[PDB]
Every structure is written in structure tokens, then in C-alpha cells.
Amino acid sequence: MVKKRLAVLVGCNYPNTRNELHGCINDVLAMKETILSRFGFKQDDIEVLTDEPESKVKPTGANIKAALRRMVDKAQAGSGDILFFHYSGHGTRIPFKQDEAIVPCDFNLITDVDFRELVNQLPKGTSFTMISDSGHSGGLIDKEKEQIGPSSVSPAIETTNKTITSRALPFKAVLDHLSSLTGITTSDIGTHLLELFGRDAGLKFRLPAMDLMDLLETMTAREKHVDSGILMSGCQADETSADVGVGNGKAYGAFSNAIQRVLNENEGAMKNKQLVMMARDVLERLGFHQHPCLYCSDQNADATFLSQP
Numbered sequence: 001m002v003k004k005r006l007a008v009l010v011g012c013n014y015p016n017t018r019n020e021l022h023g024c025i026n027d028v029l030a031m032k033e034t035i036l037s038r039f040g041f042k043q044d045d046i047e048v049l050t051d052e053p054e055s056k057v058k059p060t061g062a063n064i065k066a067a068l069r070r071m072v073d074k075a076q077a078g079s080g081d082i083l084f085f086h087y088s089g090h091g092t093r094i095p096f097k098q099d100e101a102i103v104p105c106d107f108n109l110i111t112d113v114d115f116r117e118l119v120n121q122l123p124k125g126t127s128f129t130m131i132s133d134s135g136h137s138g139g140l141i142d143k144e145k146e147q148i149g150p151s152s153v154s155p156a157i158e159t160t161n162k163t164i165t166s167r168a169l170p171f172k173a174v175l176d177h178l179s180s181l182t183g184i185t186t187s188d189i190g191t192h193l194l195e196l197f198g199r200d201a202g203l204k205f206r207l208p209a210m211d212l213m214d215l216l217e218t219m220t221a222r223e224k225h226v227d228s229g230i231l232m233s234g235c236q237a238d239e240t241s242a243d244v245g246v247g248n249g250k251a252y253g254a255f256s257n258a259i260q261r262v263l264n265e266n267e268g269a270m271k272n273k274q275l276v277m278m279a280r281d282v283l284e285r286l287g288f289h290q291h292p293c294l295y296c297s298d299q300n301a302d303a304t305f306l307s308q309p
Contacts, residue, residue: 004079005042006045006071008064008071009032010059011050013025024167030257079125080125083128090102091103099111101140131259168241236293239289
């Protein structure tokens with residue numbers, strides 16, 4: 001029985017804009033080399049969506065969700081397929097409570113209910129490992145149980161001397177960017193997103209609130225018996241993630257680089273909980289104040305990262 005190893009790698013540098021980053025595409029290329037070498041992924045099973053000017057497939061909201069949607073609908077029940085999704089780019093929070101989201105290059109926001117809907121499309125036994133090196137990345141898979149974070153873990157280190165830039169955009173910056181495209185002025189971000197993207201907008205913005213409630217009740221019932229999502233966030237829900245370096249071609253994400261360092265120092269198979277904890281140790285010692293978090297079931301917290309033997 002053939003097992004599939006599929007990957008979608010997304011990197012947004014937003015070049016030549018007001019929200020430029022410099023290490024996100026390098027994060028994608030480094031993670032692509034890691035899964036090709038160490039974890040047995042094949043070139044034909046990896047989709048890369050980066051926003052360099054000459055890119056042929058840009059990481060728009062529709063293109064990202066379509067790529068994740070092609071990984072869905074290939075996972076088979078009882079096959080234990082291995083799905084992987086890496087995101088390096090800007091994140092944001094949108095409104096008593098706030099939702100977490102990533103910011104595609106066209107600002108077609110993908111929120112935490114979108115990823116909760118995604119993991120509920122997967123059969124039991126399959127794994128969806130998501131590494132989101134972005135601001136406010138904690139909780140990007142809504143209702144996924146926090147295994148490592150502010151509610152599951154118990155001297156101050158001097159702040160890093162590296163040159164860093166935040167991978168989080170304020171809500172006003174996202175709203176103003178969408179206003180520059182629509183030409184309308186309203187405080188409802190869903191109105192801009194529905195106008196711009198229509199059926200390709202986020203699930204939160206297409207469904208009326210009570211219709212979304214009925215949909216979430218079906219997921220709550222399914223999550224009591226199937227739990228396939230594994231989220232490794234670069235920071236907490238109330239934090240940002242650091243983009244390290246300048247535009248010299250050597251920039252990187254602090255969390256993505258910490259993951260690569262832990263893998264370089266531990267060649268054997270590593271549990272999902274162990275990888276996040278050691279990545280937290282790396283960033284804490286290096287003076288970074290972001291706290292990577294882990295969200296998955298108890299069984300997947302004890303499973304090896306990407307099912308390495």
C-alpha cells in the first residue's frame with residue numbers, strides 16, 4: 001500500500017511594497033531541501049508558491065487554498081498519508097475576541113476557521129503538519145488542542161542583537177490595503193474581501209454567522225473522533241514572529257531557522273512535541289521573545305515529525 005507525502009510551501013516577501021519581508025522565500029527553499037533529503041518527499045509532490053516578481057504561481061489566497069485543496073482529496077482513509085504545509089509571511093488578527101489569519105500576497109485573508117475546515121476534510125490516520133512562521137500564528141487551526149503554549153507550559157534573556165522585522169501586520173494596515181483595491185471605505189473587512197474575491201474569500205466572510213455556527217457544530221462533532229491537524233506556530237496568538245536579517249539574500253525567519261537547527265543537531269526521528277520544545281529552547285537562548293506553540297491531539301504530540309522512522 002503506497003503512502004503519499006505531499007507538500008505545499010508558501011513564502012511571501014511582498015517585494016517592492018510597504019510590507020516587505022526578506023527571509024520568507026529562503027525559509028521555503030530551506031524547508032523544501034529538508035523534506036526532499038531527510039523526509040523522502042518527491043519533487044512532483046511539492047507545490048511552491050512564492051511571490052518573487054518573476055514567479056509563475058503567486059501565493060494568492062485562491063492559489064494557496066487551491067494547493068491545500070489538491071492535497072486534500074488525495075489523502076485516502078487508512079493509508080496514513082503525510083501532508084505538509086509551510087507558510088512564511090505576514091500574519092494578522094481580525095475581530096471580545098480576535099481571529100488569527102495569514103496574509104497572502106493579494107491580502108485574500110485565510111483565517112483560523114479556514115484551516116479548521118481544511119483539517120476536517122481529512123480522513124482518520126492521515127496527518128496535516130502545518131508550520132506557520134508568521135505573526136499571530138498561534139491558534140491558526142481553530143479548536144486544535146494546545147499541547148505547548150501559554151496554557152500548557154509553566155530569568156530574562158537579553159534581547160537578540162540581530163536585525164529583526166515583524167511578520168505581523170496591524171488590522172488597520174490590512175484594511176487600508178483592501179481599501180486601496182476596492183475604493184470603498186468601511187470598517188467591515190469582510191465587505192472588502194467579498195467584493196474583491198467573491199466565492200474565493202475566506203469562509204468566515206462568505207457565510208452568515210449562524211450558517212457558520214451550524215457548520216462549526218458539525219466539525220465539533222467530528223473532532224471528537226478524528227483529529228488530524230498538527231500546527232507548529234512561530235509565536236503565540238498575541239505575539240509576532242521575527243524576520244531576521246536584511247535584503248542581502250541571507251535573511252531568514254527566526255522560527256524556521258530554529259527548526260532547521262534542531263533538525264541539524266538531531267538526525268534521529270523526533271516527536272512533534274520534542275521539536276517544538278527544542279525550537280523554543282533555541283529562540284529563548286538566542287534572545288528572541290516569540291514563543292513557538294504546538295497544537296495537535298495527544299496521540300500526534302507523541303508521534304514523530306513527518307512520520308520519520
